[PDB]
Amino acid sequence: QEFHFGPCQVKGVVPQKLWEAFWAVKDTMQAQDQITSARLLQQEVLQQVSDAESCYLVHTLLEFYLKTVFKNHHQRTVEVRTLKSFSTLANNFVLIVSQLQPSQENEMFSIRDSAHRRFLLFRRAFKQLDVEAALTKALGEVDILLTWMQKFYKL
Amino acid sequence: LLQHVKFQSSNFENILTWDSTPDTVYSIEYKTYGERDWVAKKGCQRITRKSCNLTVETGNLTELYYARVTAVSASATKMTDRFSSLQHTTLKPPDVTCISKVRSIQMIVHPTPTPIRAGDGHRLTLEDIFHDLFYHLELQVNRTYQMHLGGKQREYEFFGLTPDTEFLGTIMICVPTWAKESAPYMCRVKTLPDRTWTG
Amino acid sequence: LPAPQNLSVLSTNMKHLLMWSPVIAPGETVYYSVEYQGEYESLYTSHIWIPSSWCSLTEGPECDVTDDITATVPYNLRVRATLGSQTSAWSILKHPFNRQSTILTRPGMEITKDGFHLVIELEDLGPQFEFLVAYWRREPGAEEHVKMVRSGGIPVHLETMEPGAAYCVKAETFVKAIGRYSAFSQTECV
Ligand SMILES: *[C@@H]1O[C@H](CO)[C@@H](O[C@@H]2O[C@H](CO)[C@@H](O)[C@H](O)[C@H]2NC(C)=O)[C@H](O)[C@H]1NC(C)=O
Numbered sequence: 117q118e119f120h121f122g123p124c125q126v127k128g129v130v131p132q133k134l135w136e137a138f139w140a141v142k143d144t145m146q147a148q149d150q151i152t153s154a155r156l157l158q159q160e161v162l163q164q165v166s167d168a169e170s171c172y173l174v175h176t177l178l179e180f181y182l183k184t185v186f187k188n189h190h191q192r193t194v195e196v197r198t199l200k201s202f203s204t205l206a207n208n209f210v211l212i213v214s215q216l217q218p219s220q221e222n223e224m225f226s227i228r229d230s231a232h233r234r235f236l237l238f239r240r241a242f243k244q245l246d247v248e249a250a251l252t253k254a255l256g257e258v259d260i261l262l263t264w265m266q267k268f269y270k271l
Numbered sequence: 272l273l274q275h276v277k278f279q280s281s282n283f284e285n286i287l288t289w290d291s292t293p294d295t296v297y298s299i300e301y302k303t304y305g306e307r308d309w310v311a312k313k314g315c316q317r318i319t320r321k322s323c324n325l326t327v328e329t330g331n332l333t334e335l336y337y338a339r340v341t342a343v344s345a346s347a348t349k350m351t352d353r354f355s356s357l358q359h360t361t362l363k364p365p366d367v368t369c370i371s372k373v374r375s376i377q378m379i380v381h382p383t384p385t386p387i388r389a390g391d392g393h394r395l396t397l398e399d400i401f402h403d404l405f406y407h408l409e410l411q412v413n414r415t416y417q418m419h420l421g422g423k424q425r426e427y428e429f430f431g432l433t434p435d436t437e438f439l440g441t442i443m444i445c446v447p448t449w450a451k452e453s454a455p456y457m458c459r460v461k462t463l464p465d466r467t468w469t470g
Numbered sequence: 471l472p473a474p475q476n477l478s479v480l481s482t483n484m485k486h487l488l489m490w491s492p493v494i495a496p497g498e499t500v501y502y503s504v505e506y507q508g509e510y511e512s513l514y515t516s517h518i519w520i521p522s523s524w525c526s527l528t529e530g531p532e533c534d535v536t537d538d539i540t541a542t543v544p545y546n547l548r549v550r551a552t553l554g555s556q557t558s559a560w561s562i563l564k565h566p567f568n569r570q571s572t573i574l575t576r577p578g579m580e581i582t583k584d585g586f587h588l589v590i591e592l593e594d595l596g597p598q599f600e601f602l603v604a605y606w607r608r609e610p611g612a613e614e615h616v617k618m619v620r621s622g623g624i625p626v627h628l629e630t631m632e633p634g635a636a637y638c639v640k641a642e643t644f645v646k647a648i649g650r651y652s653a654f655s656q657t658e659c660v
């Protein structure tokens with residue numbers, strides 16, 4: 117039992133432990149996002165991603181979470197429990213990303229383009245918000261990301 | 272005023288409840304996270320009851336929802352936490368048929384239907400919804416030890432038992448990746464007495 | 471205040487103990503504080519250390535950091551001593567700790583038999599662990615079966631036995647988070 121994002125296999129990351137970390141802080145993080153009218157990880161981003169797409173999309177989304185979202189969260193939080201819960205998620209996301217070596221050959225170009233398209237729909241939604249508000253929202257939406265990834269946890 | 276406004280979810284039956292005058296009046300609205308418009312739940316405007324069935328209106332599994340209660344004496348408004356049925360739902364015990372035989376006990380796990388319906392079609396079961404779902408079955412023998420069986424299949428049978436003896440079956444649904452485990456179904460049963468000469 | 475020295479992690483069956491030599495302070499009793507970074511923090515936010523769950527102002531020369539190590543990646547750990555105003559400088563663990571290197575022992579194990587049925591009770595090593603149990607009828611013939619047992623502390627049925635030959639059993643441990651099994655325990659036969 118591993119994640120299988122098309123051909124990339126990811127071991128050592130237990131989905132229920134990712135939940136346990138996020139559920140310690142989910143309420144406080146969701147309560148803080150005062151914008152109920154907008155969702156960044158929208159349906160168009162994650163609905164019926166093909167197996168061959170999935171690896172490129174997951175790489176791009178996680179990197180964005182690592183480089184942008186968690187980094188600025190770490191830099192700003194004043195609650196130790198969210199520092200600990202997001203460390204757990206960011207550390208496991210590091211382990212996922214190290215195991216993603218999707219193909220870089222030309223026959224895959226239009227598949228990576230579809231995956232990048234989905235990512236850019238998320239990115240655009242994120243940049244339409246003020247930056248403090250977009251960070252808060254992206255933190256509180258981690259659950260949407262975990263729920264999608266779990267679909268690929270199989271034999 | 273209004274405290275404890277929240278969802279309870281059992282087998283994706285999603286019930287809003289709240290608590291804190293005696294002639295106080297409650298009105299309910301719901302909404303999808305990411306859409307702008309609040310909708311009025313028909314059947315739940317200006318009620319005295321503390322309960323409201325949103326099973327239909329919060330039944331798309333890819334969405335998250337908000338609901339909101341407005342109260343006023345004979346005013347204040349409170350909204351729920353962001354709600355995901357997948358995350359929040361508890362699982363009822365499975366429906367099981369335990370059949371006693373002379374040297375075994377057979378158990379048939381029935382699929383569990385749900386109020387979730389697949390786009391244009393049939394109501395989905397828990398087995399459809401959670402690909403990682405499985406059953407754990409235990410038979411307590413003497414009172415010392417246990418026989419364990421489990422898997423995705425539905426029919427199970429514990430072999431090697433003594434005729435004419437009391438056992439306790441307990442059967443759970445497990446969805447390990449969501450850290451969900453059902454309430455147990457239980458059957459206390461006796462293997463039939465052995466009246467033939469077959470041993 | 472001297473900083474604590476000789477930092478190491480003893481990690482046994484997914485329990486991780488950070489340890490150091492005590493700082494000498496005839497007079498008052500010294501307290502210690504532990505902080506950590508996962509690899510994430512190490513690479514992307516290297517200036518940020520997180521307080522340990524159970525060791526801020528702890529007393530003994532150790533800390534169970536099990537609850538802080540929550541991914542299979544290398545972790546930095548540092549510790550310091552306090553005695554009122556005087557804090558020591560921080561001491562950093564020399565080689566970052568990765569729970570992939572935990573010491574998996576062979577599991578303890580008790581065989582029992584109520585008449586004809588054969589039963590096993592493993593030692594409760596925790597949620598991190600699944601148990602593989604190999605068992606066989608001890609003749610040239612039968613080939614060894616395998617029952618996965620979720621949890622220790624419970625006497626579980628393996629096989630109902632047949633007359634004639636002894637039945638033999640050994641057990642092993644498996645840890646999904648690191649991809650590793652332990653050695654088998656000693657074979658026992660009834
Ligand atoms: C909440 O409402 C749903 C229907 O809107 C109820 O359950 C289903 O609906 C009808 C009427 O009860 C039945 O024909 C189905 O068999 C029911 N399905 C399930 C899975 O129960 C549900 O019981 C309601 N709960 C309340 C009023 O508490």
Ligand SMILES: *[C@@H]1O[C@H](CO)[C@@H](O)[C@H](O)[C@H]1NC(C)=O
Pocket residue numbers: 159163331332333334388389390391
């Ligand atoms: C659930 O929501 C999404 C988009 O909002 C949709 O594509 C899917 O078909 C929905 N379920 C239905 C219409 O039954």
